[PDB]
Paper text:
Molluscan hemocyanins form decamers or multidecamers of 330–550 kDa subunits, which associate into huge cylindrical supermolecules with molecular masses varying from 3.5 to 13.5 MDa. Subunits of most molluscan hemocyanins consist of an N-terminal segment of six paralogous functional units (FUs; a-b-c-d-e-f) and a C-terminal segment with a varying number of FUs.
Therefore, we constructed the entire structure model by rigid-body fitting. 5 symmetry that is shifted towards one cylinder opening (northern hemisphere of the lumen). In TpH, the FU-gs form typical FU dimers, but in this case the dimers unusually occupy the northern and southern hemispheres of the inner space alternately [cyan FUs in Figs. The segment of the wall FUs (a-b-c-d,e-f) is invariant for all ten protomers and there are two different possible conformations for each FU-g and FU-d* within a single protomer, thereby resulting in four different protomer types, namely conformers 1, 2, 3 and 4.
Numbering used by the authors: 1 to 411, 3726 to 4140, 7455 to 7781
Write the structure that this text describes.
Amino acid sequence: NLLRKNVDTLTPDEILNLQVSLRAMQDDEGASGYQAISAYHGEPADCKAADGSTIVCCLHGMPTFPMWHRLYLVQFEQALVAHGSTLGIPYWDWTKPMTQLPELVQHPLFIDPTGKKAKKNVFYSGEIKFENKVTARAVDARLYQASQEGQKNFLLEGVLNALEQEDFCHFEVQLEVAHNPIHYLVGGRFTHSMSSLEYTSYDPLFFLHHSNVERHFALWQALQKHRGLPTRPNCGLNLFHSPMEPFGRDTNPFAITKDNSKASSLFDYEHLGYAFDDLSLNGMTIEELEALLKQRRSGARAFANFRLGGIKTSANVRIKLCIPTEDKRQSDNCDNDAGQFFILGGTNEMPWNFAFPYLHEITDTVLSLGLALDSNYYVTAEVTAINGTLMPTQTIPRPIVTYIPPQGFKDVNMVNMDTSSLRFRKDISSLTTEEEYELRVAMERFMSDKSINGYQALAEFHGLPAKCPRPDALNRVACCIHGMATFPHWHRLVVMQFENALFTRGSPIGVPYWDWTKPFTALPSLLADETYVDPYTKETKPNPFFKAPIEFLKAGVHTSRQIDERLFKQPSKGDHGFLYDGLSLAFEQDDFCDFEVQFEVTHNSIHAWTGGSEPYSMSSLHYTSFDPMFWLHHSQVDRLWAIWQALQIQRGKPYKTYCANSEVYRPMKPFAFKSPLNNDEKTREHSVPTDVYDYQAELAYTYDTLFFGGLSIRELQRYVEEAKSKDRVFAGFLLMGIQTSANVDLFVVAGGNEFFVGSIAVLGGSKEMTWRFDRVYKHEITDALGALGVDMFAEYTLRVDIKDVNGTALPPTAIPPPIVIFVPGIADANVKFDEQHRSRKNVDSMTVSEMNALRTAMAAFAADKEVTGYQQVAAFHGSTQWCPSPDAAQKYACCHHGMATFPHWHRLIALNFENGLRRNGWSGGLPYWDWTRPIDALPALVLEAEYTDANGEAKPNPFFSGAIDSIGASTSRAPTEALYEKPDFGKYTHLANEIISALEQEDFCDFEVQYEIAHNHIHALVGGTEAVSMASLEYSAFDPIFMLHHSNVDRIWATWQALQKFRGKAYNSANCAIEILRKPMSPFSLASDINPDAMTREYSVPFDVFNYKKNFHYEYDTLELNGLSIXQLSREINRRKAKNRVXVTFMLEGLKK
C-alpha cells in the first residue's frame, strides 16, 4: 500500500520527500519523466478516435472518465515512487472551504529546514516543456468561500449531490460535472492553465485534485457497498475492453498499468497499490453521510436539467431562475440566480455527450422566492466561455425544471363514469362498413375542399409551412414537438383537431386507430384501397385515405406512401413484433420521461417504415402530416399513452409530466395562436397541456378497449412485472436530432463476426425544430447476447450503420455512439390479485398461440369424465335426477329455464366452464364471439376438424363438434344452415335488431323474454338437421361452441345491466318474478360433490349472480353491440322509440320439438 494523505496534514519530512522526488522526475527526459507522462493527458494530441484527425488522448464525458483518471493517478504515482516518494500523491480536500491554494503550491522557492538556499519549486508549476513556457494559474474568486453564509459551498454541494445517486451513470455525470469547477476556477483566464484540458495535466495541482476526485469515487463505491447496491459500472461497456492510450502502449514504463490498461479491470482499486488515509469528507461517518443523503432525498425537490456535450471549450454556465411574463413586454423576472456549474473542454477534444441529464438542485431558491415547486417557472443559462467571452444561448440545449413529488403521491382523479356521450375511437378493424363509408364521407368533405377551416390547414399545422415560433419572420421551423416530454401532448391535441373537423362534417365516430402492435401482414383496407364505391350511386370515387394533395406547393404533388419496408413480418425482431417489443419496454417504466423516450422513438419506426424512401411520405417530418394515415396512426399513439396512463393509476404512481415540468407551461406551438392561425376553440383552450392529461373530462373522447396485446391493464401489469424480474441488458441511443430523417442499423460484434439485433428510426426534417432528448433510448440487446452465446460482461463492441431515408450514406458520427446498460430485476408485488381476475374477448380476434393454449386446456377438461371435468357441467344440461330429490320420480330435465331466471343460471354455467378451463392450464378468461355482428364462417377455433400445433399435430380437436356425451356414447355433430348474411347497407340485420329490442324495455322480465328467445337463434342455427347438435337442449351444452355462445349471451346480459345503470333503473336486482329469483339453482346448489366451483356453490341464488363485477371477478373485452357503445346504444333505442310503430306478440309455451 502506497499512502495518499491529506495535503494540509503533511509532515515537513513527507513534504521534503515529495519535493525532492517530484524534482527528480522533473529532470527526467525518459518515459518516467514529467513531460512524457503529462503528455498522456492533453496536447500534443497523439490518440486518434472514431475515424477522426489527431485528438486528445484523455477520455472525458464518457462513463470511462473515472477509470482512466484513477489509472492516470496510478501511473503518475508509480512514476513518482520510481524516485522516492515514500508517499502516494496526496489529495487536497476542496470541499473544505478555502482561503488560498494549498500552501505547498502557494509560492515557488520552497524552503528546506537545512537551508542552504532554494528553491525549486516543483509543486508551484510544472513545465510545459514543448511549446514553452510554463503556465501559472489565474485563480477565480469563487474558489474561496464559506464567508458569511452565501456563497454556500457549491463544490461540496456538487460532490454531495453526486454521492447521492445510486446509479453509476448518474453518479458519473454528476461527479465529472462536480470535478470541473476546480479545473476552471484554478485555471482561470490564462489559456495554458488547469482551465483548459489541453494543459491541465501539466500542473501538479491536477494530480493533487484528481487524487481527491478519486477519493470521491472510492467513497461512493464504499457507500454503495452499504448496503445492497452494485459497485460495478453498468454503463458503456464497449469502451472497457480496449487499451486506454498510452497505458496499453508498448512504451508504458510500468507493467502494473499496462496489465490494467483495460477499463474493465479498474472497477476496484485494491490491486493498484495505493490507499487513502480516510476518504470521508468533512468529518462525516459513512452512516452520517448516507443518513444525510437519504434524508436529503425525502420531500419534494426541483432540478435544473441540462443536456451537456463537447463545445470545444471550457465554460461557466450560470443558472438564472425565471418567473414568466404575462404581457407582451419582456418583463420575465430573471433577476435571481438559482445556480452554477462548469464544463471542461478544448480544441481537438474527444466528441462527447452525457447519456443522462445533468441535474443541478434548485429546490432551495425556488422555496426562497415563495413559489411552489409544482407551480410554473423556468430556468435560463448564461454561458461564459473561459475566454471571458459571453456566449450565445444556442451553444447549449435549454435548461428544464425537473420536479420530484413527495412519494408516494396520487395525482388528481378522473371524472366519474360517463355522461352522456363521448367520441368513441375504435380499432379500424372494428368498424362496420357503414362506419367506414361515413367517416370516408366526413374525411372526403373536410379534405375536399380547401379552406382555413379545411383539411390542408390542419395538415399544415404539424410541419413545413414552418410557422414557428410565428410565421414571421427571419428563421422559421416546424411546429410539432419532438425529442421532448411534451410530444404526446402536442399530437394528442392535433388528433382532437382532426376529430372535431370530422365530427362537424357529419361522422358519428371519433378518430379510429390501427394497432400496429398486433402483428399485421398488410395495411388496413381503409387506407390501402385506391378507390371505393358509393353504396348509393355505385360510383367509384377516390378513397380519401389513400392519398392527400400537398397544396402549399404548386405542382402535381400528392402524398406518396408508396414504399413500406423492413417491417412487415421479419427480421425485426420478434417475440411478437418489433413495435410490440419497443412499446412493451415503454409501458414498463414508472417515470414519465423514461416512458416517453421509448414511446416516441418506438413510434418513429412506423413513420420511417410506412413512409419509405418517398420524400413526400411519412418519412419526412415536413410532409408526414399531409398523408391521411398520420391521423389514424396517432390516434393509436394517443391511445398508447392512454393505456400507459391507466397503468400508472393502477400502479399508484403519478401520471403527469413532472420529469419536465417547465415545458408543460410552454404554449403548444401552432395551437396557442389567435383566431386566424387557429380556429379551434377547444384545442386552443388546451394549448397549455396541463389539463390535457384527463382522458375524457376536458377533451370528451375515449377508446373502445385499453387492452394492449391481448392483455388487460392488470394483465399488462403482470406482464411488465414478469419482464422486469429478468436480468436484462440494453443498447442506449442519445438521439440528438440530426437535420434529416434517418434509419440506423444496430450490430453486436463478438469475435470476428457481427449480429443484427435491430433497427431504429430517427424522424426529422430540413427545417425541423431543434430537438434533443434528456435521457437515452434503451433497445433490448439481451436476446441477441443470449443467441450470441456471449455473456453480459463479455467483450463485444457495437456497430451502427446510419443511412438517410433518401438512401445516401450517413457517417456513423451523425449520432453519438450507443452504450451498453445492465438492469437486474426484482419485485415483491406480486403478491397480487391476478388469480381472481378474468378478461373475455372475441375468439375472432385471438392469436394462434392463444388459440393453441385454449385448445390444450379443453382437451384436458374433456378427459375427466365425472365430477370435475366438462362432461359434468355440460350434463347440468343433461337430465340426471337432480330435479327435486331424494323423492324425484318421473321429472325432469334439470336446466333452469321457465324462463325468468335463464340469464342467471346460464351465467353460472359459463362460469363453471370457465373455472374448469382455467383450472386445467389456462391464464385467460372464457372468450365469446359477436353474432350480433354478421358472420361469414364459424370462429377459427371451431371450424376445422384438425389443427396444427406448434410442432404439428393430429386432430384432438377438441373444440370441434366431436365432443362426446358417453351417455349415449356418440359425438355431438354440428351442421350449418344456409345463412346468415343478407344485410344491405342498413340496418343491423337479424340478431342485432332483436337484441336491441330486448335492450329497450325497463323491466327485467320483459327484457328477458326477447333476450333469451333471441339467444335461441344460434342454438337452432348451428343446430342443423342432425338432432345430436345444439338444436335440442338435451345435447346442446356438449358442443364447446355453447361456451362461446353463452359467453356472448352473458355479455349482452351484462351490457343491458350497464344500460340500466346509465338509465337510472335497477340493474343488479329485479322486482319481477321474485319467487324463482329466491330459489337456488338446481345443479349449482346441490352439494360440494356434484359440482367443482366453490363460488357457484356459494352464489346459487339468482339475486347473488346479478353482480358479476364484484362476485365473479370478470370483465368483458367490451360491452359494445354491433359497434355501438352503451351511450350510443341508449341514443339509438331512444331513436327507435321515438318513431310510431306497430308490434306483434306471441304467447310461447314449451314444446319438446
